[PDB]
Amino acid sequence: KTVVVTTILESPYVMMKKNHEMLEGNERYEGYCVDLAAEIAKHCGFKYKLTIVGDGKYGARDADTKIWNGMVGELVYGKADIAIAPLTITYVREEVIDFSKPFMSLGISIMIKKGTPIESAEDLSKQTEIAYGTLDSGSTKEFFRRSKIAVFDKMWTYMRSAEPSVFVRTTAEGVARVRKSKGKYAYLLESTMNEYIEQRKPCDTMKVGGNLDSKGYGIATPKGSSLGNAVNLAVLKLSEQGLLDKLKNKWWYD
Amino acid sequence: NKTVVVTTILESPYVMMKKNHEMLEGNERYEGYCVDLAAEIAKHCGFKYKLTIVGDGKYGARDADTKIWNGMVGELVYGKADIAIAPLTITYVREEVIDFSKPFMSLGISIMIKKGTPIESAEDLSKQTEIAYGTLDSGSTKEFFRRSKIAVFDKMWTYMRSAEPSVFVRTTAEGVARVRKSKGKYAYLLESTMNEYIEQRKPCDTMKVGGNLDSKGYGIATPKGSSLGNAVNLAVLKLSEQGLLDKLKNKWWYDKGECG
Ligand SMILES: C[C@@H]1N(C)c2ccc(Cl)cc2S(=O)(=O)N1C
Ligand SMILES: C[C@@H]1N(C)c2ccc(Cl)cc2S(=O)(=O)N1C
Ligand SMILES: N[C@@H](CCC(=O)O)C(=O)O
Numbered sequence: 062k063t064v065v066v067t068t069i070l071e072s073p074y075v076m077m078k079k080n081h082e083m084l085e086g087n088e089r090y091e092g093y094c095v096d097l098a099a100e101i102a103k104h105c106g107f108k109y110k111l112t113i114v115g116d117g118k119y120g121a122r123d124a125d126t127k128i129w130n131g132m133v134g135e136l137v138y139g140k141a142d143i144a145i146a147p148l149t150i151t152y153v154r155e156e157v158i159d160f161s162k163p164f165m166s167l168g169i170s171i172m173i174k175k176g177t178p179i180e181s182a183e184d185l186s187k188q189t190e191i192a193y194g195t196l197d198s199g200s201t202k203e204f205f206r207r208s209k210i211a212v213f214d215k216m217w218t219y220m221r222s223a224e225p226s227v228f229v230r231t232t233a234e235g236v237a238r239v240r241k242s243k244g245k246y247a248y249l250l251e252s253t254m255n256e257y258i259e260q261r262k263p264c265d266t267m268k269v270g271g272n273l274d275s276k277g278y279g280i281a282t283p284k285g286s287s288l289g290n291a292v293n294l295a296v297l298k299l300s301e302q303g304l305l306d307k308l309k310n311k312w313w314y315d
Numbered sequence: 316n317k318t319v320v321v322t323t324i325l326e327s328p329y330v331m332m333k334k335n336h337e338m339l340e341g342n343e344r345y346e347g348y349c350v351d352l353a354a355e356i357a358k359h360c361g362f363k364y365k366l367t368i369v370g371d372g373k374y375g376a377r378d379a380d381t382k383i384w385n386g387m388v389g390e391l392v393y394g395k396a397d398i399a400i401a402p403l404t405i406t407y408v409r410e411e412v413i414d415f416s417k418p419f420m421s422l423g424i425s426i427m428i429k430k431g432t433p434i435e436s437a438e439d440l441s442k443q444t445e446i447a448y449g450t451l452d453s454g455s456t457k458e459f460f461r462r463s464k465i466a467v468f469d470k471m472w473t474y475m476r477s478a479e480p481s482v483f484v485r486t487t488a489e490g491v492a493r494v495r496k497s498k499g500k501y502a503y504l505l506e507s508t509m510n511e512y513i514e515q516r517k518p519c520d521t522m523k524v525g526g527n528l529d530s531k532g533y534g535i536a537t538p539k540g541s542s543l544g545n546a547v548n549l550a551v552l553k554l555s556e557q558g559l560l561d562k563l564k565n566k567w568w569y570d571k572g573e574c575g
């Protein structure tokens with residue numbers, strides 16, 4: 062009767078507390094999604110255990126084996142009962158799992174070293190001095206692979222063959238490359254993470270131009286889960302009480 | 316298979332009467348964002364449909380006494396329509412009685428003023444009484460202020476609910492006209508989508524001030540347990556990821572803007 066929640070280490074959604082080595086269970090973690098999980102469980106009235114996804118991935122279907130990895134796979138293959146994390150609502154995912162109404166908005170955004178002469182995605186697709194890449198096994202990478210839009214298709218064709226790999230396993234990994242590469246690398250990531258980094262030291266990164274798309278994160282359940290309805294209503298309630306806004310302010314507090 | 320009844324509402328630029336509507340019939344009488352959206356959705360889910368303007372011209376609220384739903388929500392609840400394709404706001408009380416797809420457009424509650432009006436925030440409105448302000452009836456915006464426990468919004472509700480004469484309007488157009496005619500003495504609380512649209516229409520004498528008071532979206536609504544729900548939801552996501560929804564908003568908001 063304990064609900065297994067799958068989630069992922071991603072600041073400021075889920076982070077390890079200081080001195081977590083002597084802590085146990087859910088008390089090991091803090092962040093936006095940790096608070097969110099507590100509020101949902103309170104409303105739906107269930108006990109839950111937070112577990113970090115084994116592979117540290119969000120969820121992608123390996124075209125070769127047609128096997129889902131990451132948090133999506135955990136739901137699909139019955140390892141978890143619910144995903145509470147910055148998991149992007151997409152078409153391919155909605156085909157295999159259920160999403161609640163979005164609890165937070167985001168768009169794919171460009172992260173440049175401050176001062177970098179880039180103002181748009183067109184600018185990136187018209188230069189080769191500055192490199193660019195995305196996170197592996199995520200919705201951002203799938204966006205460019207699938208985009209039949211002019212600029213985005215060009216950006217993808219460069220990215221898929223880039224040597225060495227412009228793709229990273231973690232968001233933190235992509236952050237460093239923008240910083241190290243002296244303005245020769247632009248990271249493609251979601252505006253939420255981008256806006257978060259923009260506020261943190263050494264404050265040398267910059268969100269540039271508008272978002273490339275418009276979407277949201279949603280709480281995910283296995284298809285035909287009895288938990289789905291109550292969770293969706295919980296999210297809506299929290300939104301209308303303004304609690305989602307206060308959580309955003311709290312963890313993106315400058 | 317049967318012709319699907321679509322309930323919707325005459326709200327610019329979502330559903331508008333074509334210039335030659337009087338010599339047109341069926342769905343051909345109408346044009347707008349939601350009309351194009353309905354065509355796209357129907358094509359993917361492979362159904363034929365008939366657009367129907369909701370009888371009472373309301374979005375949907377539940378009578379406190381009779382517990383009866385009006386507007387487009389009522390149409391779905393009592394089985395008069397199979398689907399709603401309109402700027403219908405996703406809310407908690409509505410999700411309890413009908414289903415919504417994932418949102419196809421984002422909005423927040425915003426403030427409309429006549430240009431030059433000394434108001435830059437909702438707190439500015441709550442602090443004064445010289446400038447009156449209100450909302451649309453039978454809609455999600457009015458329910459927001461009625462239900463809010465946030466001090467400034469509750470202060471605004473306490474004012475609005477007892478204001479004389481009534482600061483509430485029956486249509487968006489009535490609300491816009493009231494802003495334009497009141498010489499800066501009326502501000503209108505409406506959804507950012509509507510606000511931004513009007514901002515681009517002649518006489519170009521209004522504007523949106525401050526940030527949005529909340530964050531939500533419009534969704535395609537179906538009766539609970541409808542078999543159309545899944546296909547429609549998937550269709551909305553597909554159109555979103557193809558960039559179709561962004562192109563539709565550009566077409567109806569800014570591609571024909573009249574204020575430069
Ligand atoms: C179709 C649908 N769209 C457009 C939007 C729009 C805004 C937000 Cl905050 C979330 C979503 S989503 O993730 O529910 N999905 C992609
Ligand atoms: C909870 C949920 N929230 C926060 C949001 C946020 C952004 C958009 Cl575009 C739509 C919605 S909604 O209408 O699906 N609903 C109110
Ligand atoms: N939120 C994304 C991961 C972040 C990214 O791909 O940039 C997902 O759900 O796949």
Ligand SMILES: N[C@@H](CCC(=O)O)C(=O)O
Binds near residue numbers: 403453
């Ligand atoms: N979109 C609102 C109506 C407009 C408003 O209330 O401002 C609704 O669905 O109730």
